Amino acid sequence: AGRISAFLKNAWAKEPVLVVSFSVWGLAIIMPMISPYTKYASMINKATPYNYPVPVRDDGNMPDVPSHPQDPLGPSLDWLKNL
Amino acid sequence: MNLYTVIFINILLSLTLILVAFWLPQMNLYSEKANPYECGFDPTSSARLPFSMKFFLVAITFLLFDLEIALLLPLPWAIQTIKTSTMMIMAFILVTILSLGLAYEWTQKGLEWTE
Amino acid sequence: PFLDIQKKLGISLDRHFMFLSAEQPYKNAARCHAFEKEWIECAHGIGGTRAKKECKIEFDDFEECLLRYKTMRRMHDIKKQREKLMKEGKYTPPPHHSGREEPRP
Amino acid sequence: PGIVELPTLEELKVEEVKVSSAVLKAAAHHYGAQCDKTNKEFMLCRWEEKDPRRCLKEGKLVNGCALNFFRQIKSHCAEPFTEYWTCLDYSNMQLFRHCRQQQAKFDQCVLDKLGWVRPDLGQLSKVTKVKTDRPLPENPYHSRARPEPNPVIEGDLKPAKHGTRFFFWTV
Amino acid sequence: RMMRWNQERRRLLIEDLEARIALMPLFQAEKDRRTLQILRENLEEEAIIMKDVPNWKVGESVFHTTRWVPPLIGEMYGLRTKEEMSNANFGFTWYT
Amino acid sequence: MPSTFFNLTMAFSLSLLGTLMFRSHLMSTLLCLEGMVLSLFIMTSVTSLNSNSMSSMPIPITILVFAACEAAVGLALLVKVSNTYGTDYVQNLNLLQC
Amino acid sequence: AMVKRFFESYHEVPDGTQCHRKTYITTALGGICGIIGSAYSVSLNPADSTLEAVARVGRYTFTAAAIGAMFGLTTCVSAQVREKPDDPLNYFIGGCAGGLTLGARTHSYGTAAMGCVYMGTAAALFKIGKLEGWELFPTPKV
Amino acid sequence: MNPITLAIIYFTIFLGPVITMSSTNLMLMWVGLEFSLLAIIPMLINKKNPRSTEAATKYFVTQATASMIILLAIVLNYKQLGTWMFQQQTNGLILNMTLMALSMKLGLAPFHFWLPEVTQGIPLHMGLILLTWQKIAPLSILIQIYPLLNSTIILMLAITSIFMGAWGGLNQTQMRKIMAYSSIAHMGWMLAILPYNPSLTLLNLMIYIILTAPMFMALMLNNSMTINSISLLWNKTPAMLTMISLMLLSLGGLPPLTGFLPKWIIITELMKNNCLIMATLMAMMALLNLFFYTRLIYSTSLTMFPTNNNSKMMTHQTKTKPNLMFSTLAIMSTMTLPLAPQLIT
Amino acid sequence: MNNYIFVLSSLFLVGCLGLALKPSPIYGGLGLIVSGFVGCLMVLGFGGSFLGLMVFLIYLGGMLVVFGYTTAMATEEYPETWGSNWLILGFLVLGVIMEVFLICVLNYYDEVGVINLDGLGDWLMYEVDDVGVMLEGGIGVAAMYSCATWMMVVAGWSLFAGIFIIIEITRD
Ligand SMILES: CCCCCCCCCCCCO[C@@H]1O[C@H](CO)[C@@H](O[C@H]2O[C@H](CO)[C@@H](O)[C@H](O)[C@H]2O)[C@H](O)[C@H]1O
Ligand SMILES: CCCCCCCCCCCCO[C@@H]1O[C@H](CO)[C@@H](O[C@H]2O[C@H](CO)[C@@H](O)[C@H](O)[C@H]2O)[C@H](O)[C@H]1O
């Protein structure tokens, strides 16, 4: 792979703009796949409450649903507070 | 109402300057003064004859590229989606195909002006 | 569709934004969501010919909700009768219809 | 072609919570923690019943709960609260982040005087369950009975009787 | 630095949107009463204006169904001044 | 809404009448097609807004995207016509009568 | 519209009676066909000037109206004289009279003769269709 | 064209109709028709002469105008009912402009005048695509709304197309113009039956396509553009004389050939619905097609026209065409009437 | 302000009448620019924002290309305006008179049907979610990236194929 290295070196000296464009394009694809923070971007969009959280009627069979907003049940946002 | 008000004032100010410029100065109209300028000699033809466009292909490519950016300008709202992976793939694919289209036209000499 | 490829593959390229009652961004219901939901549900499973006669109530309501022909005419009649009486000097609009209301809250 | 039933003006009289938006926003976090049960009852009525006329009793309890909440602020924490919502009211967007100094003074007051703990980030947006004696509406859309589906034809398949029967073709 | 600042701005937006959530029950109750009172007021004037009109039923629905149908802006402000109607049509969109 | 949609439909009808009643320039006809596109864009957009149908707002944008492709091809064809005859007049485009 | 009703009035009364009204109806129908034909002619085969286009529109319309008048008059007079309301032969005579008119206007015995037979047969079949309940544009049934 | 261009353009030509046939949304159906128009233009004008430029331009302005009218109907229906498909409650005028605009896209008379001119101005293999592949998407839309269509407009379009396809083909010496008038006549039959039995519309479309495809391949074999050119077949490729004659008689609907079946079945179904007068008129004027096909058969296989001296040099050369698709379609378009019950239901 | 949207849709109608008369494409191009601006205002007036600004921006770009093409391939010694030809001018004036007549008569026969001059301004906005946050038209358009990706696939393909198409049409 010494033939390409001379090719890439010449392209860097003579067509640097195109070399940067292709490198940036390749980095943009790669970075979301290897970043540890990629998962949080969807989670942050999911935690933004644009709509009223309509309560549910309590039927006596909801051990997981909080009865008050300061109950220890329901989705916590500690992960975002310390992000 | 406010945006309408200020733009009307902007229109009003511009039109007043035009009226002043046309009615304040002393005039002296005669044919040689009002004939079209061409470096002291008369034109040999109308300026209304066809004027060739050597970049006509770039021009109609610009029409398609201008609808491509129209497809990109919702991106600030689209990044708010829960479906981040879907949005990201759609945006990446959209930009890449537009790049491939530009790359093809570039290698076909479509950006070179005609002679 | 002429070819039911989408149904055969169990995908949805364009089946899911076909009418008002479909899913909206951020759960912002479109106008007449409840009327269109009732009309679509009445018609389901019985075919178009039967639906035309037997879901006629639902379609008329939905049609009124969306195009509002009757609502516009009814208000036109009240406002036209008010114009006649005021010219004859037989009706005086109340203070709250004249811009001097006691605003709530 | 029926008459639309509307409550009388007398039925719609309530004691108004007539304070400005900066006052409401300044108190909004403690208000959400203190009046949750009454507020969640009213919102469950509205989404279940889909009719504001069916929720007037619960709507009036929302107003009374809000006035009892603000009278507790008035009797104990009036000056810390006034300093806070006045600072919050200066901003064109009424942003919390420009008055953290005054918010802390108000928060400390309602904690010592009334024991009120401000909810954490994320807590007010939770879906919660609420208990209600109100029955569940059975047909909230007032929908008619659906037309009956077409009768289905049953049995096993047999060959077409005498084949295709297309003119002179035998099979 | 943009990552950290935008993550902070996302936490601030949630706090602001959660204040709205807490107050929304009160605004809903107020708005229900306001809409119903305006509709009530229209009904009383219709009872006087359409008194001597043949076959007019005061308060008649245009729909077969009996479920609650929210009024249109034209219905709520049809009998009020042109400014109240203009404010409903253009208030937000012409506020800059 | 009622009167606005009437006027928009009339605006489409006029643009179509412009398309159907040629003068000399092919380009003048290509502009009439863009007029019909413009009318249909507003009609679709206003309908989506009036019904609060946010899931239909992609559709008006797709109308403009394909109209741009239609207009680009129309202009590309017009270059060919002008190269042959030195004008864009439609009366020259009559060789296929025989 | 009422314009449709004006054409249903042809069949409101039996043939051989109200021959004046039936002649106006068929004269109007003939004129309309002349206007439609003239529109396609001038659009697709343009005249050398506007006055020739307008002259050709008048020539087609009046000739077509004349054919419709002769058909409507002759059909009713024939049924009145022969006292046969429901005879397709009355319509054949009228269609032949219309076909002869077309030949007289265009100066052609071959069009007169060919016009008489084709228009007579078409008109006679129209009467048979009216009597036997034939539909020109039936809606789908099966 | 280089391979990348061919692949993209041919893929888009294929894609458009597939989108139209698979779409639930009327807007995506319109998008499919848009792909077809855009992708076919560069193929129409590929050879780049004044006639091909004229053909591509006339095709573009007709098709784009019809596309706008179709879009108007879709938008008006969206305004009326808040949906993206035509219903039983769709306003009848909305449906009538859809029918008008689609019939203009198909080249049905009286919206037919463009089609013989465009077919004449383009290569034979492009005429083949124009008259076969490009019919499928507009017809597919119509078949979906067949209960909604107005029988009066359809029959008037149908009888007009059969009449003008017949008289139109009678005056032609150009092969590409004869095929265009043959298209218009057969479209008249397809349309007449659509509101009654859309399955018989598809039966006629299939039989028309497998007749027209091998007829175009036969013209392509020597590039025969005129009657006098095709009349040299006896000297250039005499082996084709049998199949061209039978395909022409099959296109004319003569029994016992496969092409008799579409006319026979459509008449049967039209008369089950009491559409006797139209069916009679349609069948009688379809005989005029058999006249100009017969005159074509007279000049190819039943007489021998004068030949020329240079044609001897052609007899020294070997050919590599037709492909075996010609023989398959040629046989199935002529000799399959015995299998008629398997084709209608 | 109760006549605002009717005035705009009335101006839009005149613009299309001017375009339909087909003067020189220079003035045709100007006619579409003004109609595009008036069309943007109508979308804004109905609560739009993104869609109105898009169509004006797209048509500003589109008519600039048409201006360039007009000066090269669609120009004559004496370009025609609306006033140049008495016949075009008369149909411009007659067309405007027939608009006033058509709106006047339709108002008389129905009064609330297509034309409702008594109720102008009462039936522009029907329902509005008063306390909503996420409601602007850009959010709806952005669903192409998440919920309506098929719409964006076909749009993207047509622009991509358009490049190959116009290169083929234009090569000699
Ligand atoms: C021919 C055209 C070619 C150009 C187009 C190429 C497009 C291909 C894009 C490849 C990159 C996709 O990158 C992908 O990003 C998403 C988020 O967006 C990451 O997804 C990750 O974060 C998301 C939140 O967003 C979590 O919900 C998910 O569980 C996690 O996997 C994937 O781990 C990564 O693989
Ligand atoms: C010159 C000879 C021409 C030969 C062609 C055939 C001629 C016969 C047709 C003319 C007969 C009288 O004219 C015929 O009767 C009247 C006119 O008022 C109408 O009669 C019919 O109208 C409508 C059709 O729209 C029917 O629904 C109605 O039941 C029937 O009365 C027809 O529209 C017209 O065709």
Ligand SMILES: CCCCCCCCCCCCO[C@@H]1O[C@H](CO)[C@@H](O[C@H]2O[C@H](CO)[C@@H](O)[C@H](O)[C@H]2O)[C@H](O)[C@H]1O
């Ligand atoms: C019940 C029977 C009633 C019989 C009347 C109805 C039948 C009408 C027949 C119309 C015949 C055509 O009408 C006839 O056309 C010929 C065509 O040569 C024309 O005849 C005249 O002009 C032509 C040329 O224009 C000359 O060649 C000819 O020498 C001269 O006589 C006349 O216009 C008319 O004499």
Ligand SMILES: CCCCCCCCCCCCO[C@@H]1O[C@H](CO)[C@@H](O[C@H]2O[C@H](CO)[C@@H](O)[C@H](O)[C@H]2O)[C@H](O)[C@H]1O
């Ligand atoms: C040379 C040109 C002429 C070609 C001749 C064509 C074949 C011969 C035509 C015979 C005419 C058919 O005659 C007609 O047939 C139809 C169909 O059964 C029937 O007519 C009736 O049919 C059904 C009832 O069955 C009714 O709904 C319909 O409205 C009515 O037309 C009558 O029997 C007769 O009115």
Ligand SMILES: CCCCCCCCCCCCO[C@@H]1O[C@H](CO)[C@@H](O[C@H]2O[C@H](CO)[C@@H](O)[C@H](O)[C@H]2O)[C@H](O)[C@H]1O
């Ligand atoms: C037709 C259907 C079957 C084929 C399917 C489609 C895939 C085809 C794959 C082979 C295509 C390669 O085709 C190749 O395209 C490139 C486009 O970059 C052209 O090449 C282009 O760029 C290169 C740059 O070095 C130069 O040759 C020149 O600037 C230009 O022509 C080549 O001249 C052509 O040979």
Ligand SMILES: CCCCCCCCCCCCO[C@@H]1O[C@H](CO)[C@@H](O[C@H]2O[C@H](CO)[C@@H](O)[C@H](O)[C@H]2O)[C@H](O)[C@H]1O
């Ligand atoms: C229902 C019954 C079905 C009937 C089937 C019809 C059979 C086909 C009829 C069309 C005949 C084909 O036409 C016939 O073609 C053959 C070649 O094949 C020609 O054959 C003759 O001329 C060619 C050259 O032209 C010589 O090479 C050949 O050896 C010689 O026999 C005939 O001169 C021509 O008339």
Ligand SMILES: CCCCCCCCCCCCO[C@@H]1O[C@H](CO)[C@@H](O[C@H]2O[C@H](CO)[C@@H](O)[C@H](O)[C@H]2O)[C@H](O)[C@H]1O
């Ligand atoms: C190119 C520009 C075109 C300009 C077009 C014309 C613009 C002017 C519009 C006139 C149309 C009617 O305009 C105006 O409509 C309002 C409703 O909003 C009517 O409203 C008012 O009067 C009518 C009764 O007369 C009642 O509705 C009521 O008393 C009051 O609201 C006005 O009386 C009418 O004058």
Ligand SMILES: CCCCCCCCCCCCO[C@@H]1O[C@H](CO)[C@@H](O[C@H]2O[C@H](CO)[C@@H](O)[C@H](O)[C@H]2O)[C@H](O)[C@H]1O
């Ligand atoms: C032959 C050329 C065509 C092949 C190339 C195109 C490949 C397809 C790529 C586009 C894929 C679209 O894929 C489709 O996405 C939509 C959302 O947009 C998903 O839709 C899903 O989520 C939506 C969100 O509102 C729900 O309303 C819907 O009920 C559900 O099915 C479909 O389940 C999925 O099938």
